[PDB]
Amino acid sequence: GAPHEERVGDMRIVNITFSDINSIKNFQPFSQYFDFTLTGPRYNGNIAQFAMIWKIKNPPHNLLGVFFDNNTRDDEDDKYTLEELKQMGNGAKNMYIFWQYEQK
C-alpha cells in the first residue's frame, strides 16, 4: 500500500477514484463483484459474483461502492454507514472503496 493509506487494525483502506460508475465495469478483478443494475452504493457481505448488493446507509453523494476482500459480515440494507463499515472488515485485509471524482 501507499504511504497515506488508512488502516483499521490489519485492514488496509484503499480509496480508488473513477470518472464515473461506467469506468468500473472495465476494472478487473473488482467489476465481477459489483451489481451494476442497482441504484445507490452497496457493500458485500461475503465473497461471490455480484455480491455487492447491501445498501450503505446515509452514503456520501459520490460514493460508488465498498468491497471487502475476505470474510463475512452482517448483510442488510440501510443499516450500516461507510464509517461503521470500516469497523466491519472481520478479517478482510483490504477494504476497497470506490469513488466518483468531483472537483470543489
Binding site: 459474483q49 455480484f50 455480491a51 448483510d75
Partner: protein, 65 residues
C-alpha cells in the same frame, strides 16, 4: 433462469438480485435458518454461497464451521 431450490418456494424474484439468481436462492431463503430441498433440511451458507446440510453448521451460525 431465476429459480429458488427451496421446496415449494414460488418466489417471483421481485426483491432478489443477480446474486440470488446466480445462486438459486431467493432473498428470504438465503437467510432462513432451516429450509427443505427435496425433503432434506439445509441452510444457505453465507461464506460459501451454497446450501449445506444442517450438520455442517454450529448452533445458529450463518456459515459452516
Amino acid at each position: 433462469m431465476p429459480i429458488c431450490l427451496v421446496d415449494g418456494c414460488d418466489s417471483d424474484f421481485s426483491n432478489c438480485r443477480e446474486y440470488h439468481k446466480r445462486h438459486k436462492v431467493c432473498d428470504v431463503h438465503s437467510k432462513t435458518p432451516v429450509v427443505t430441498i427435496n425433503g432434506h433440511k439445509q441452510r444457505f451458507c453465507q461464506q460459501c454461497s451454497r446450501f449445506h446440510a444442517l450438520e455442517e453448521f454450529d448452533e445458529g451460525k450463518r456459515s459452516c464451521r
